[PDB]
From a paper:
Phage satellite P4 polarity suppression protein, Psu, a building block of the viral capsid, inhibits hexameric transcription termination factor, ρ, by presently unknown mechanisms. The ρ hexamer adopts an NTPase-inactive, washer-like, open-ring conformation until NTPs (preferentially ATP) are engaged and RNA is bound at the SBS, leading to ring closure and RNA entrapment inside the ring. Our cryogenic electron microscopy structures of ρ-Psu complexes show that Psu dimers clamp two inactive, open ρ rings and promote their expansion to higher-oligomeric states. ATPase, nucleotide binding and nucleic acid binding studies revealed that Psu hinders ρ ring closure and traps nucleotides in their binding pockets on ρ.
We, therefore, also determined cryoEM structures of ρP167L-ATPγS-Psu complexes. In this arrangement, a single additional ρP167L subunit can join one ring at the center of the complex (complex IIlocked). Parameters listed for ρP167L-ATPγS-Psu complex IIlocked refer to the ρ1-ρ6 subunits of ρ(A), which retain the standard conformation. Also in other complexes, lateral access may be restricted due to conformational restraints imposed by Psu binding. Such conformational restraints may be more severe for ρP167L, which exhibits higher Psu affinity.
Numbering used by the authors:
A (entry chain h), B (entry chain g): 4 to 190
Write the structure that this text describes.
């Protein structure tokens, strides 16, 4: 059930990021409209700029969180698929890799590491050889629907909104300003 | 037929290494027998020491070549076994790795390399788990005989006879000395 909770937390993160983007766009269009207005409202313009900055930071944080959650869902799905696949074909896979994998239970640390790295890049070469053909890859039947719903890759909006990087001091100041803004808006 | 060629090359290299070892042992025994004698034979002792050094260098070269050929034949066997195993189970393996390897036919270089790396350490984790359960690994039935004859690892004598690490200068000096020794033996 870990896959299901990963999936619906990813969906919640997506919904939160969409809400953040929507409210940021609403604030931006309101600020532009007040710029077009005749009224000066200098204090209103400054506070709107502050709101725009803090909500852009919130959108960036939400996009980063959603991207991380999506990557976690993909990683756990990969882990489970390798698990049940190789429970299926472990004997054959080890037979294909016996000269580097036999005696693993008693080999020393350096020998174990070198053997697993040799098996590793042998597997990498095999994957390259298969991908050279260009066969179409379909999803696992057991977990196809969840991974199709989350998509192969996050949207370009997610990666671009998360492109901006913030220093820890910027992170704490933006968190404090966002908390203050939320408290003020609630009251 | 490449596997058979590598196997017989490894066998020939092992035979040559054994021949060099027995020649060096005979030279050492004869040198000790002369040294234990009351005769001086200073020139004889010096030329025997030269022959001993030449034989030791030849033994090192033969052991290194034999180890390299054994590694090569093991690598070829692994490549062929993993190739036909993955030709058998490619659909299932790609389905297990579907959420991460799609689009390889047209993705950019950096994305392709990162996807290959992520699939690679996912496979590493799966193989590590299998080694954790501890089921005994057997050689592939198609080429079990060759892999058993060549052994799981090269002989420890070849392992500790190839730790001299001669410098290139010493390498061609010993090559010239060995050629001169062969010419003198012909005389």
């Amino acid at each position: 059930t870990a896959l299901q909770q990963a999936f619906d937390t990813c969906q919640n993160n997506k919904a939160a990021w969409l809400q953040r983007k929507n409210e940021l766009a609403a604030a931006e269009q309101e600020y532009l409209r007040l710029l077009s207005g005749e009224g000066r409202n200098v204090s209103r313009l400054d506070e709107l700029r502050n709101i725009i900055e803090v909500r852009k930071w919130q959108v960036n944080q939400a996009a980063g969180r959603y991207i991380r959650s999506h990557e976690a869902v993909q990683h756990i799905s990969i882990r489970d698929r390798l698990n049940d696949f190789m429970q299926q074909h472990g004997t054959a896979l080890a037979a294909a890799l016996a000269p580097e994998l036999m005696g693993y239970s008693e080999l020393t640390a350096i020998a174990r590491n070198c053997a697993i790295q040799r098996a590793t890049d042998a597997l990498r070469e095999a994957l390259l050889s298969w991908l050279a053909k260009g066969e179409k890859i379909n999803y696992s039947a057991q977990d196809s629907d969840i991974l199709t719903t989350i998509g192969f890759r996050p949207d370009v909006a997610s990666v671009d909104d998360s492109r901006e990087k913030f220093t820890p001091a910027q992170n704490m100041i933006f968190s404090r300003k966002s908390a203050q803004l939320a408290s003020r808006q609630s009251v």
